[PDB]
Amino acid sequence: MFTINAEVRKEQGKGASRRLRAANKFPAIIYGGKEAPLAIELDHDKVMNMQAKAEFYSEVLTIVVDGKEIKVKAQDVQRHPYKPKLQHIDFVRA
Amino acid sequence: MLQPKRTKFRKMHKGRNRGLAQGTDVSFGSFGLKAVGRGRLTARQIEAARRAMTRAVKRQGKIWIRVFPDKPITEKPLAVRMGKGKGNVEYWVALIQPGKVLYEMDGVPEELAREAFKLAAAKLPIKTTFVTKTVM
Amino acid sequence: MKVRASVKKLCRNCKIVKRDGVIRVICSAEPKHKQRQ
Amino acid sequence: ALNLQDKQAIVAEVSEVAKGALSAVVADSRGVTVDKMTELRKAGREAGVYMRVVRNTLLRRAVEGTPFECLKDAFVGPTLIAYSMEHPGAAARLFKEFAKANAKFEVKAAAFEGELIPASQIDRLATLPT
RNA sequence: CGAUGUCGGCUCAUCACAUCCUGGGGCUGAAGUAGGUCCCAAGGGUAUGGCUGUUCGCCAUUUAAAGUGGUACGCGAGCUG
RNA sequence: UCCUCCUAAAGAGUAACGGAGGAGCACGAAGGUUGGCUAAUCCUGGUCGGACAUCAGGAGGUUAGUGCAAUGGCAUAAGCC
RNA sequence: CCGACUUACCAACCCGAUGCAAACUGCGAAUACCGGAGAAUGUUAUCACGGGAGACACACGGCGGGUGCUAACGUCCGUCGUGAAGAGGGAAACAACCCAGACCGCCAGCUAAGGUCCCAAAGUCAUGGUUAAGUGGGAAACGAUGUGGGAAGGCCCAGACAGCCAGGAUGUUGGCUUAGAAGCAGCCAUCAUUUAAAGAAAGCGUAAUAGCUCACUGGUCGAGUCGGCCUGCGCGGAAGA
Ligand SMILES: [Mg+2]
Ligand SMILES: [Mg+2]
Ligand SMILES: [Mg+2]
Ligand SMILES: [Mg+2]
Ligand SMILES: [Mg+2]
Ligand SMILES: [Mg+2]
Ligand SMILES: [Mg+2]
Ligand SMILES: [Mg+2]
Ligand SMILES: [Mg+2]
Ligand SMILES: [Mg+2]
Ligand SMILES: [Mg+2]
Ligand SMILES: [Mg+2]
Ligand SMILES: [Mg+2]
Ligand SMILES: [Mg+2]
Ligand SMILES: [Mg+2]
Ligand SMILES: [Mg+2]
Ligand SMILES: [Mg+2]
Ligand SMILES: [Mg+2]
Ligand SMILES: [Mg+2]
Ligand SMILES: [Mg+2]
Ligand SMILES: [Mg+2]
Ligand SMILES: [Mg+2]
Ligand SMILES: [Mg+2]
Ligand SMILES: [Mg+2]
Ligand SMILES: [Mg+2]
Ligand SMILES: [Mg+2]
Ligand SMILES: [Mg+2]
Ligand SMILES: [Mg+2]
Ligand SMILES: [Mg+2]
Ligand SMILES: [Mg+2]
Ligand SMILES: [Mg+2]
Ligand SMILES: [Mg+2]
Ligand SMILES: [Mg+2]
Ligand SMILES: [Mg+2]
Ligand SMILES: [Mg+2]
Ligand SMILES: [Mg+2]
Ligand SMILES: [Mg+2]
Ligand SMILES: [Mg+2]
Ligand SMILES: [Mg+2]
Ligand SMILES: [Mg+2]
Ligand SMILES: [Mg+2]
Ligand SMILES: [Mg+2]
Ligand SMILES: [Zn+2]
């Protein structure tokens, strides 16, 4: 099972996202079901070395936020135009 | 030499080349060549690159050209003054922005596709890179 | 000794070296492959 | 290839000691394929392919299969060495063929020190069940 | 533009190297002489005549070689028209 | 000389020997009012009749039409009797 | 007549996916513009009339564009700033670039741009790394075991990686073009022993093999090793009077 550790976005916006991307991180959103959407921060290298597997977009993901387990699945992703990097990932709670 | 068969108007303005691209991900074949720089591609550079990659792969497999020259670049004659109207259309140019994929290829080994696209990059003016298709 | 800008390896017996800040290419079995930047 | 294959060939060598017997040394520092068709054609003269010269005397390879079978052969480990197990005919003539073959144009043969049946040493022996 | 005088030619030169020769070297499909290509190197030298007002260019005959260009397409308070 | 779009940077306006087109008319009905109606195209079937005249249906929904060049509008129709 | 077919070709409508448009919008900002109310501030800074002019040759820089070569200290439009009509400090010199708007005098002090080794006034200031090219102190496509890093990956103390040694295997004059293609020329076919392995050879070498080799394959050997990636800074390319 692909396990990831995440943070919580205290500040949003273009500036916050660019700071996260320059600090070897990137924002992501988790939504679905009936609960409130959650804005998380993820490490860049630890997810770039994981998404290269085809199982990453088919299997389940176990995300750890505030010391609890959340079962999500990859739903959408935005990639850098001309670089092998990531900018945002949308997960569905499932 | 790619060229539209008809157009509403013969001469267009210059405009700009600001912003990123839309066709970033490979959607037709398996491997692709993606621009990193920003410039212009004529109807001759693309033809030369296509011929080079065709010779590299020995006409095997299938290739796709996702760009097309639709901007009628014009040039005035030599030794003429300024004004007196607009020049005559000479060649066609496709605007290229970073992230745009120029060529795609399928049914070819990756180790041969890399050199087939390197040959095309060596003739194209802008800098490019080799990419592969990915699952969403 | 062909002097150009792009220097690389042509055969398997070529060794790229740097002497006095200048890049040189020498092959142990083909004098034609001797290149200089 | 990794652990699975090294260990595989080794354990395969161990199974050949479970039903093996007399053995001998051989070290062709300058061998020829021509001699391949002498001792191994001799293998064909005995029965078949089963006989393994398995020249792989790395102290952590062939000697690695030693602690489970015939630990006295551990001292045979050093230098180039190829163990020669048997199966048909207990104490067969495969042993003497190394000594005779070495004198039969083969440069060298690990000084024909032999292996283990009486737990002994370099000894030319015609004293085999014939 | 209440004037910076203009093409060519004669005399007079000077600087540069992407060098014509001389100098040194690498490769050669360089057996040798004679060659082809490339690198360094400006110290020196780098033609006389017929045609044309001509630079350029054609031809004759030499030369180790008969260089490329800049100097207000060098130089008329130096000459020529 | 006058009219339509872009350049004209989401109020108006805004130039070039800029890029694309038009006008120097017409109508006593092509005006007003009242009353009524909605096509272009395609498919199927039918005599001359053919890809396309006329006639029946069906799909389609302004992709037609505006007296004229273009733009903005027109179903309560500004379109058609 | 009617046609039965496939076929080195092209392709309408529709459907699925990918793009482009100043004269294309089923979408649609930020700015800007009109009007109203409200607190604060601005020497009424607003408007109307009358007297008097001057001017209608602008340039540069930023942003938004057309024509040019997405050339010009080039030309044509919108906005702002400066010069014109603005002195002073800075960019070595410099009308338009940055800071900043000179009532006058003072041998008083505080700052901005910009700087603190000398010319020339101020840190040879402290901690932390980078550079070895005078990069700094002119430039590209492209090329390179230049180094300073980050994240991974392969192989690896049953021995990796180099070296250091043995062998790299029966035909096969190959199915062949046969001049000869012998393991290395175009078809091919690519078995099969022996194996510890080895393509019925990857190359030089050839008439072609041999040969010399390459994967290999054993033996030796005693800790890493190999290649991609993401980058900081640096080198070549780099020729003028
Ligand atoms: Mg911002
Ligand atoms: Mg624009
Ligand atoms: Mg030297
Ligand atoms: Mg004058
Ligand atoms: Mg005067
Ligand atoms: Mg005069
Ligand atoms: Mg030189
Ligand atoms: Mg000198
Ligand atoms: Mg001297
Ligand atoms: Mg005469
Ligand atoms: Mg002159
Ligand atoms: Mg004169
Ligand atoms: Mg004078
Ligand atoms: Mg005269
Ligand atoms: Mg407007
Ligand atoms: Mg406006
Ligand atoms: Mg009417
Ligand atoms: Mg009515
Ligand atoms: Mg009909
Ligand atoms: Mg109309
Ligand atoms: Mg009416
Ligand atoms: Mg538009
Ligand atoms: Mg207001
Ligand atoms: Mg005027
Ligand atoms: Mg004026
Ligand atoms: Mg003006
Ligand atoms: Mg101007
Ligand atoms: Mg501009
Ligand atoms: Mg300009
Ligand atoms: Mg200036
Ligand atoms: Mg002017
Ligand atoms: Mg004035
Ligand atoms: Mg000033
Ligand atoms: Mg002012
Ligand atoms: Mg000043
Ligand atoms: Mg300056
Ligand atoms: Mg000064
Ligand atoms: Mg002070
Ligand atoms: Mg300061
Ligand atoms: Mg001082
Ligand atoms: Mg110090
Ligand atoms: Mg450089
Ligand atoms: Zn070589």
B48: domain CATH number is: 3.90.1170.10
Question: In units of Å, what resolution does this entry have?
Answer: 3.1
Chain A within 8 Å of B39 (Cβ-Cβ)?
no
Does residue B16 lie in a domain region?
no
Structure-derived torsion over alpha carbons of residues A71, A76, A82, A86, reported in degrees to the nearest 10: -20
Does residue B15 lie in a domain region?
no
- Going from the C-alpha of B56 to that of each of A1, B7, B52, B101, B119, the distances in angstroms are 42, 35, 6, 19, 8
Instruction: Name the 3-class secondary structure at D54.
Output: coil
CA nearest D23: which of D77, D76, D91, D74?
D91
Nearest-angstrom CA–CA distance, B106 and B62: 5
CA distance B90 to chain A (A): 31
Does residue B55 reach within 7 angstroms of strand F, measured from its CB?
A: no
List the domain range (segments joined by +) for residue A93. Answer: 1-94
Does residue B15 reach within 7 angstroms of strand F, measured from its CB?
A: no
Does residue B54 lie in a domain region?
yes
| The amino acid at B45 | Q
List residues bridging with C15 in a β-sheet: C26
Does residue B18 reach within 7 angstroms of strand F, measured from its CB?
A: no
Residue B112, Cβ neighbours under 10 Å: how many?
16
CATH of the domain at A52: 2.40.240.10
Structural domains of chain B, count: 1
Q: B82 C-alpha vs ligand 32 centroid, how far in Å?
A: 29
Structural domains of chain A, count: 1
Q: B95 C-alpha vs ligand 29 centroid, how far in Å?
A: 23
Q: What are phi and psi of A71, to 5 degrees?
A: -95, 110
CB nearest A57 (choices: B24, B34, B135): B135
Nearest-angstrom CA–CA distance, B84 and B106: 50
Experimental method reported for this structure: cryo-EM
Q: Which ligand is nearest to the CA of B16?
A: 2
List the domain range (segments joined by +) for residue B77. Answer: 21-136
**Helices first, then strands: H and E counts in chain B:** 2, 7
CA nearest A63: which of A37, A93, A33, A20?
A93
